[PDB]
Amino acid sequence: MSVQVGVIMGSKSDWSTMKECCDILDNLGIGYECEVVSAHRTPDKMFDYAETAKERGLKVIIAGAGGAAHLPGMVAAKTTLPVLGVPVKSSTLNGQDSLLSIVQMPAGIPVATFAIGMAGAKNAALFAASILQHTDINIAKALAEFRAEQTRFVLENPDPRE
Amino acid sequence: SVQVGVIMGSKSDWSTMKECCDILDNLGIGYECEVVSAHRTPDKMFDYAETAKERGLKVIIAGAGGAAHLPGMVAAKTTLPVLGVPVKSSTLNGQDSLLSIVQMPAGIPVATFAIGMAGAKNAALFAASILQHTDINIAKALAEFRAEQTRFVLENPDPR
Amino acid sequence: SVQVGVIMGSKSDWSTMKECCDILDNLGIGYECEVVSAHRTPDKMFDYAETAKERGLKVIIAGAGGAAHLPGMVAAKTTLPVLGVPVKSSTLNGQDSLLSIVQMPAGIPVATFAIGMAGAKNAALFAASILQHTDINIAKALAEFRAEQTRFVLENPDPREH
Amino acid sequence: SVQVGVIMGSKSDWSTMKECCDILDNLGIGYECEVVSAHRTPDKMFDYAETAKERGLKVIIAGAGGAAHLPGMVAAKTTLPVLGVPVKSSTLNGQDSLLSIVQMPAGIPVATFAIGMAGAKNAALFAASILQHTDINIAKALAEFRAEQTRFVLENPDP
Amino acid sequence: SVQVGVIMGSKSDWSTMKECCDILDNLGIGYECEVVSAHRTPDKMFDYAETAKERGLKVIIAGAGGAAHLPGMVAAKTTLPVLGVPVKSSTLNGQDSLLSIVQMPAGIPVATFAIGMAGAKNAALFAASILQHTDINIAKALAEFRAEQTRFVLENPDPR
Amino acid sequence: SVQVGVIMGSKSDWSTMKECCDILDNLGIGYECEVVSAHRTPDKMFDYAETAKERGLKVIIAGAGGAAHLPGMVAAKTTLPVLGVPVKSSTLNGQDSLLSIVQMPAGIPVATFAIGMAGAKNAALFAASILQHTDINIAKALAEFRAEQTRFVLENPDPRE
Amino acid sequence: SVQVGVIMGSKSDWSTMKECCDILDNLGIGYECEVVSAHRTPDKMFDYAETAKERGLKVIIAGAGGAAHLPGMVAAKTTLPVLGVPVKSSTLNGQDSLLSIVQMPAGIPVATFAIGMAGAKNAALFAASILQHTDINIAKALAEFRAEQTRFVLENPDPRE
Amino acid sequence: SVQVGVIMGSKSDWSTMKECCDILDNLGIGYECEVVSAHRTPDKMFDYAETAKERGLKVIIAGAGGAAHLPGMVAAKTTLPVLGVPVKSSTLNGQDSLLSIVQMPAGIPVATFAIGMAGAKNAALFAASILQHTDINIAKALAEFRAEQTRFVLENPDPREH
Ligand SMILES: [Cl-]
Ligand SMILES: [Cl-]
Ligand SMILES: [Cl-]
Ligand SMILES: [Cl-]
Ligand SMILES: [Cl-]
Ligand SMILES: [Cl-]
Ligand SMILES: [Cl-]
Ligand SMILES: [Cl-]
Ligand SMILES: [Cl-]
Ligand SMILES: [Cl-]
Ligand SMILES: [Cl-]
Ligand SMILES: [Cl-]
Ligand SMILES: [Cl-]
Ligand SMILES: [Cl-]
């Protein structure tokens, strides 16, 4: 089970969201590491994490932050690996700040952005799977079964009065 | 060889999506560009998405505005990564576009980029970052692209 | 006869859409209710929309939240009137749902109602206003519904208890 | 025959609402068009709404901007389906118009469409989708409209 | 003497509008309270507005939420000053209420206050400021209300 | 009889606030107009508010944009009714103006009108409704203003040419 | 030695502004904390601002919600740096507070921080970053606060706990 | 003497940040101005921030648009006060810029000013209010600026002036 995804977040308070990303990676049998890496409070460590990611065997980085969420964009500035950004739902502005701070990157350094909150955490994992499946048969199979399952679940339960 | 499918809901999106295509050309990445309407050509859209993998595509980049459903619906019908570009809408300046693309519930992801030209450029660059993993020439091209933009700023520090 | 199809992207929408169904029952309008996911069951969605007219449906009421594509994609595949109900999302309180539904470009319309339960109820009542033109029992039932809600306000004019 | 009432809050709304009327013309749907202000002509508004059904109208399409009350207040006074078109306001780009029309509490519905010209067009097309059940030529005109818009995109795939 | 009409779109608005009525009581201003639904009782609404002046009302205070049409529609049918209170809506936190009331085009004004209880309270205080010119007792009651809220803060500088 | 004070934070607001003054002229209501800056002339703003009532004013109409503090701060310093006009700001289209005026907490009210010229016109008309109960000529003028605007619509029902 | 004035429009802002005071205490910075309402005590607010420099204050931190005018109005009446903290309003979650503080037109600046407790804490830290220039003990306290927060994240990399 | 560093993410920010520099010029405040991109020149940004205090800078004014990370990331790497100017973006009129700058979590502050030109001017004036404590000539210049702006309004009370 090779470690192919780095899941990183600006603070421990982002874990209730980011754990849902790790849960999907676990369910899909994808190897990952999870770490608190703060753009603001540990900037030098953030640069190091990004700089070394490729040589460490990582293929995708998933980064979550809230508020003025700079972590995903700053990582993306320092690696050519694909970076996925998860806007963590802020208590004040409901992740609207997080979302704009991540998605509105000017041209040159992209961050793939997903839905605010847990929906986006889970979707970032599934999207990472969608990238990794091209060179990992186990992942292709696990992702296909995931999608087959979610389709089957709706088809088998059509009546909402159940 | 055609590895990226660049699609958009209408011809009016071309002024945005052309910038995505310009980057793929610059990086030596094969692509096709096509108008595919989720609302006006729903059957073609389903067929496009269903056949993408077997036609050799590795990534789909989809642009739409307003109630922008094209990226999410293509994503529902292919296992390939789909990148969504919110097109700047005349009434709400892409606010509608962005929310309609990015706020996908858990299960079917769409990787979303900035509203407008910025997003169209970054989706192309992100596609390059997916494709570089198995293509040396693309890794080199993307590395050079980044060096070029870095150099442009470093060699032009005085804003006057 | 079944004249209205009430559909929703997920079972989590039933707490909103059951309020639609409650009004159709009160007005004696025939309907079916079903979970039809635009993202997880896209094929069934197309099939449902494609055949609704030949099945005898005259209106479709479709609820969805977040990036809410169900109403619009149904409307792309049927010439029947499609009524869209934006389900109140947990992050953005239905703002995403509303914009995702109402901001349809010219060519394929979706009639949109208020976010949440209010919209669900109103879609049912709007369906009644479409169907009363060829059904006298529905006309009477709607006239009575409107007369009763008017009486309720009039019967209790001063809200002070003391 | 006149089956659609197209009303608007002020003459300044006509650059938007004319786009509704153009689609109605194209589909062969008879209509009347009038300026009916909720705030400047409230009695005329109530009168218009009250008699619409008895005058043979089947659908009312109402456009207004800003604090846009015309659609909702018409809907309050007719049992006919009322379609609401939020006009693009100069200050807030129709966000006021949109919320003022779509956010009706339970009991009196207004079917709401996109802000601006897009919603004006879509209101016309939705009126057609209501009227097609009882009218063959309208059913035909709407089928042909949809077929032609689909063909136009299929014929023009290269941007 | 009943000089202020306090009206509201539904009974559920009473939790907000009660706060308006409380201030009018504290200032010794006569008022009436009534549920008047723009949408469910439109004829009653027109009759309320048409007869207000002849009934001796001087100010109307109208609360409503969502697509809040009551204040504007009353203002269209009376030349009396109409104060609007956007009631805090469950979905959009009164943003719909606020725009629906404040964004009246030129011709028929509605004086608009804060969303929720704050605005309800302030509409009552503003009614007092309109009426003060015609009654020394209301003028004194309002001056005293202000004097008291000022003294309450000066006397309590320490938040600790 | 100068009964209404029309004030604004800056000269750049005059294109909006002149429309308020135009209605007051049309209705025969006496007024004065002045540039009074809450941030650049705070002392003058306090003095203006403090002395309004003794100077004969009955209503103050105040326009400002951005972080629009003039209406609320004038209302803090006079017992007279204050009418606030959110001026359309260049960056946020008067969203900032509107929230900065209307969202006064309980205790000190400001009657707020629509963003821009619409609000400026409507503040003047609202001032007229406050004052009409005082001069039969103002009541008549306001009633005529409404009749004329109604007549423009009733006599011109067809938007098509 | 009292160098920072921490003021707020109402006592209900204390659960937010207390977090500012906690940081100033931890950094050893002298402060005073007072309720000063721009709308209910406008004269006191003018006098506070006018005499702040005389009283030895170097920075003023001002919190307010809703139509939040306290920071801008203090800034109009002192040349001392004024830091604005937008308090989280119950209706609009501090959006009104934020726009009312930050969108000051050119001429009278207010340094604005995040909505709510994060902004209260940051205003205190920012005040420290002003005072460190002429106070070596404050320079050292701030440097260590930042080293402490950095070390804590570095020592706790694992989000499981 | 150079006491203020004025930096901006891109040359397109100059039409806004030039207004900051104009005020600094008018007040007699020494500054330097440079394009420093958080995303395209991250190492240079870090270097600029790290060395600012030892180069004799006392205040940094940073402007950026969109997902505006420059001010926060500079603030993470210097103990000096950082002033943030949200540049008015084409799409979202600086709403993204503003949230990206002002919504910094606790620990690393950025003093934020109004969106656009107003904020650039105000950042310059706020820098002056920091520097006035140890620079007599700056104190005099800022006092004169405030007196003049007050005078201008007092001397032009009638908006009908022509
Ligand atoms: Cl570090
Ligand atoms: Cl097709
Ligand atoms: Cl689309
Ligand atoms: Cl399916
Ligand atoms: Cl959906
Ligand atoms: Cl209207
Ligand atoms: Cl009634
Ligand atoms: Cl209402
Ligand atoms: Cl002065
Ligand atoms: Cl102001
Ligand atoms: Cl006082
Ligand atoms: Cl305040
Ligand atoms: Cl660099
Ligand atoms: Cl940046």
Automatic annotation (TrEMBL), chains C, H:
Chain sites annotated for binding substrate: 10, 13, 40
GO BP of this protein: 'de novo' IMP biosynthetic process
Record's signal peptide: none
Catalysed reaction, written as an equation: 5-carboxyamino-1-(5-phospho-D-ribosyl)imidazole + H(+) = 5-amino-1-(5-phospho-D-ribosyl)imidazole-4-carboxylate
Keyword Lyase assigned: yes
Alphabetic keyword roster: Isomerase, Lyase, Purine biosynthesis
InterPro entries: PurE_ClassI (IPR033747), PurE_dom (IPR000031), PurE_prokaryotes (IPR024694)
Limits of the PurE domain: 2-153
Keyword hit for Isomerase: yes
Protein name: N5-carboxyaminoimidazole ribonucleotide mutase
Species, as recorded: Francisella tularensis subsp. tularensis (strain SCHU S4 / Schu 4)
Automatic annotation (TrEMBL), chains F, G:
Reactions it catalyzes: 5-carboxyamino-1-(5-phospho-D-ribosyl)imidazole + H(+) = 5-amino-1-(5-phospho-D-ribosyl)imidazole-4-carboxylate
Residues of the PurE domain: 2-153
Keyword line: Isomerase, Lyase, Purine biosynthesis
SMART domains: AIRC
GO molecular function: 5-(carboxyamino)imidazole ribonucleotide mutase activity; lyase activity
Residues holding substrate: 10, 13, 40
Pathway(s) per entry: Purine metabolism; IMP biosynthesis via de novo pathway; 5-amino-1-(5-phospho-D-ribosyl)imidazole-4-carboxylate from 5-amino-1-(5-phospho-D-ribosyl)imidazole (N5-CAIR route): step 2/2
Enzyme nomenclature, EC number: 5.4.99.18
Gene Ontology terms: biological process: 'de novo' IMP biosynthetic process
Highest rank taxon of the organism: Bacteria
InterPro entries in the record: PurE_ClassI (IPR033747), PurE_dom (IPR000031), PurE_prokaryotes (IPR024694)
PANTHER family from the UniProt entry: PHOSPHORIBOSYLAMINOIMIDAZOLE CARBOXYLASE, PHOSPHORIBOSYLAMINOIMIDAZOLE CARBOXYLASE CATALYTIC SUBUNIT
Record-stated family: Belongs to the AIR carboxylase family. Class I subfamily.
Name of the protein: N5-carboxyaminoimidazole ribonucleotide mutase
